[PDB]
Swiss-Prot record:
Gene Ontology terms: cellular component: extracellular region
Annotated binding of Ca(2+) 1, by residue: P175, V177, D200
Organism: Parengyodontium album
Name this polypeptide is given: Proteinase K
Function noted in UniProt: Hydrolyzes keratin at aromatic and hydrophobic residues.
Entry annotation: catalytic residues: D39, H69, S224
Domain Peptidase S8: 7-279
Domain of life: Eukaryota
Keywords: Calcium, Disulfide bond, Hydrolase, Metal-binding, Protease, Serine protease, Signal, Zymogen
Length: 279
């Protein structure tokens, strides 16, 4: 399948070269997979989700996304026009308030929830968790992400946005999950993207158009915009039988475009996520 006048980042992950504008993907597009966006909530009523999203857990007085951040991230995973895995199921887990902040014990409660809740859903091709959130290093939060991945959910996390070695942030630094830095549309590391050997992969994270609240759209930036591109790609590749939750980070990094990016510090991977699609 081909989606013309795609957002650049979609086009970028189905190409070996920058600068095109079409998104090439297999029509399965994540059917039978499930992605949990752990964030500020999702606006499931948004036309772009077409009945495929719902909110399953909050830790605040409301399940609603009053911020926008989680609706944007969910749109990059799953929306009809803006998403990578257009047919996946999209679950919302509100661990962040409507200004975007949480306490680490609630973020920890949220990961534990998905490890349990996946068994109450119908995800025959598998389960991904996307966490466009980070703080300073906390062993407790690293261990929760490790448990979530161990349970059989493919965990993808934002490297962080401080232009620093991600070893000092969590859960970016946990080795067993899939740590995601961000690139721009000319194949440079984004200016804010954390780096270092704990990174696994880069994805598009500068000027990312996606769904916003109030039934709208907006183009925003961050490693949190790069992370759901990778999460959606994992959902896609599990529907195709190409990998499993345990080893989708390894398959993505192995099948990536290698050596395209500029502005990569020695010691960091130079790998940009690719979907391996040949029509
Ligand atoms: Ca890894």
């Amino acid at each position: 399948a081909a989606q013309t006048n795609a957002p650049w980042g979609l086009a970028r992950i189905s190409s070996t070269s920058p600068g095109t504008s079409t998104y090439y993907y297999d029509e399965s597009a994540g059917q039978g997979s499930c992605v949990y966006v752990i964030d500020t909530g999702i606006e499931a009523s948004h036309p772009e989700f077409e009945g495929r999203a719902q909110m399953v857990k909050t830790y605040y007085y409301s399940s609603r996304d009053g911020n926008g951040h989680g609706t944007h991230c969910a749109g990059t995973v799953g929306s009809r026009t803006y998403g990578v895995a257009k047919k996946t199921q999209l679950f919302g887990v509100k661990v962040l308030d409507d200004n975007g902040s949480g306490q680490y014990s609630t973020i920890i409660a949220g990961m534990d929830f998905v490890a349990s809740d996946k068994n109450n859903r119908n995800c025959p091709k598998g389960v991904v968790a996307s966490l466009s959130l980070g703080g300073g290093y906390s062993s407790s939060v690293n261990s929760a992400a490790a448990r979530l991945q161990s349970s059989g959910v493919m965990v993808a996390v934002a490297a962080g946005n401080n232009n620093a070695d991600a070893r000092n942030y969590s859960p970016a630094s946990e080795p067993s999950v899939c740590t995601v830095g961000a690139s721009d549309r000319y194949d440079r590391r984004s200016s804010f993207s954390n780096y270092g050997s704990v990174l696994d992969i880069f994805g598009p994270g500068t000027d990312i158009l996606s769904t916003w609240i109030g039934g709208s759209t907006r183009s925003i930036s961050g490693t949190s915009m790069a992370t759901p591109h990778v999460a959606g790609l994992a959902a896609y590749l599990m529907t195709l039988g190409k990998t499993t939750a345990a080893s989708a980070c390894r398959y993505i990094a192995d099948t990536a475009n290698k050596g395209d990016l500029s502005n990569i510090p020695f010691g960091t991977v130079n790998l940009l996520a690719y979907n391996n699609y040949q029509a």
